[PDB]
Design goal:
The structure is cut from a larger assembly and holds 1 copy of chain A, 2 copies of chain B and 1 copy of chain C. Chain A contains 10 helices and no strands. Chain A is mainly α. Chain B is about 55% helix and about 0% strand. The longest helix of chain B has 23 residues, at about 5-30. Chain B has helices spanning about 5-30, 40, 45-60. Chain B contains 3 helices and no strands. The chains are: A mainly alpha, B mainly alpha, C mainly alpha. Chains in contact: A-B, A-C, A-D. Chain D: Belongs to the RNA polymerase beta chain family. Chain D: This is DNA-directed RNA polymerase subunit beta.
Chain lengths: ~220, ~70, ~50, ~70
């Protein structure tokens, strides 16, 4: 639909100001273009991929043993083993490719608290690497739901890590300091933690701005 | 131009402290049984005393008296 | 930015700022082996 | 930002007839009145509210009460 109220004008005013950084880490668009398109995989295909991955890992183990202790089988069989290890590597690559947009959709929930969207996406990707290393065809779960826990716990760990790339905007420090002072005063005089309505009353701003600014606090 | 003398200077800080105490009353008047609430249980004097102490301890206009000699004071 | 919501100082800031390396020598500084006192006329003194 | 003064007068409830009756003695006031793109009180109030509350949604009650809270309450 069509609306050009004052709120939309203010939103575009903000957008033009935010657009002054070209390759902003807060923008996933280039990352989405880099993902491309790979279809969502059903349970049978995912268990197939995991089976190939484990087979390739065991083939790598045996091939590493035979590369040292002699006892090498003729080259014709060694070539099939050399094929299995490559197949396992490819299976791991495909299984990771299948869930980058899952990582993105899990990361989008943590934006606005200090870390850039792409950094959260990298942490989620590493959580996904952790997931593929623990997945088990015996347990029978869908890989998406299983890896979701690993992605979210990795994102939380990075968020809850004392050393993080918190990159708060320059044009928010002053209002955050004012928020802190006013919340402190209201806590000291009201007898309890102030609800955002009281804060908005004191700061002369809409309450949802209070809830938005409070996300940057830590 | 006009002189904001000692009395008005103290009055302004009293006003600020009473403004804080007024918010205190606005809150704890609406968080207690209407039977139990009493004037003395609605009032917290600490903001007013703190404001007066702040004036007399930190305000640029409150100054150590120049006791060099009687004329200086 | 650090925990105080303030930016971290980088390598450039070592020499960029108003108290940077390039401006340290220029500003006045306190010196040892010096004193200060009120002056009076020594009319009996020689010029040296 | 600056505005024609009549934008305030209309916001306060003055009609063009009243403004002419009071300020008709001066030609610059009439020229300001006759070169103002405001029809009446509500439009003037909304125009004032836009400048006073940039980016916020304007409504009758908001502007009408805001102009009063500014100076008359």
């Amino acid at each position: 639909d069509f609306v050009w109220d004052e709120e939309e004008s203010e939103a575009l005013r903000q957008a033009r100001k935010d657009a002054e950084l070209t390759a902003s880490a807060d923008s996933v668009r280039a990352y989405l273009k880099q993902i491309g398109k790979v279809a969502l995989l059903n349970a049978e295909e995912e268990v197939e991929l995991a089976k190939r991955i484990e087979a390739g890992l065991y083939a790598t183990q045996k091939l590493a043993e035979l590369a040292e202790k002699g006892e090498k089988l003729p080259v014709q069989q060694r070539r099939d083993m050399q094929w299995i290890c490559r197949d396992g590597d490819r299976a791991k690559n495909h299984l990771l490719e299948a869930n980058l947009r899952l990582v993105v959709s899990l990361a989008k929930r943590y934006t606005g608290r200090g870390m850039a969207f792409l950094d959260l996406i990298q942490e989620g990707n590493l959580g996904l690497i952790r997931a593929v290393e623990k997945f088990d065809y015996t347990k029978g779960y869908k890989f998406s739901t299983y890896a979701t826990w690993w992605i979210r716990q990795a994102i939380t760990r990075a968020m809850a890590d004392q050393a993080r790339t918190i990159r708060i905007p320059v044009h928010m420090v002053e209002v955050i300091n004012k928020l802190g002072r006013i919340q402190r005063e209201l806590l000291q005089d009201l007898g309890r933690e102030p609800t955002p309505e009281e804060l908005a009353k004191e700061m002369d701003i809409t309450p949802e701005k209070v809830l938005e600014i409070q996300q940057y606090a830590r | 131009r006009r002189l904001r003398t000692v009395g008005e200077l103290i009055q302004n800080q009293i006003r600020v402290g009473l403004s804080r105490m007024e918010r205190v009353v606005r809150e704890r008047m609406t968080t207690q049984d209407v039977e139990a609430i009493t004037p003395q249980t609605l009032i917290n004097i600490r903001p007013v005393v703190a404001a007066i102490k702040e004036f007399f301890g930190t305000s640029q206009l409150s100054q150590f008296m120049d006791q060099n000699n009687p004329l200086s004071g | 930015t650090g925990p105080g919501n303030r930016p971290l100082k980088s390598l450039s800031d070592l020499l960029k700022g108003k108290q940077g390396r390039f401006r340290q020598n220029l500003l006045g500084k306190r010196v040892d082996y010096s004193g200060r006192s009120v002056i009076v006329v020594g009319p009996q003194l020689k010029l040296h | 930002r600056r505005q024609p003064v009549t934008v305030l007068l209309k916001a306060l409830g003055w009609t063009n007839e009243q403004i002419v009756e009071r300020f008709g003695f001066s030609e610059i006031m009439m020229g300001t009145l006759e070169k103002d793109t405001t029809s009446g009180t509500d439009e003037a109030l909304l125009d004032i509210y836009r400048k006073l509350r940039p980016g916020e949604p304007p409504t009758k009650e908001s502007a009408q009460t805001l102009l009063e809270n500014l100076f008359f309450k």
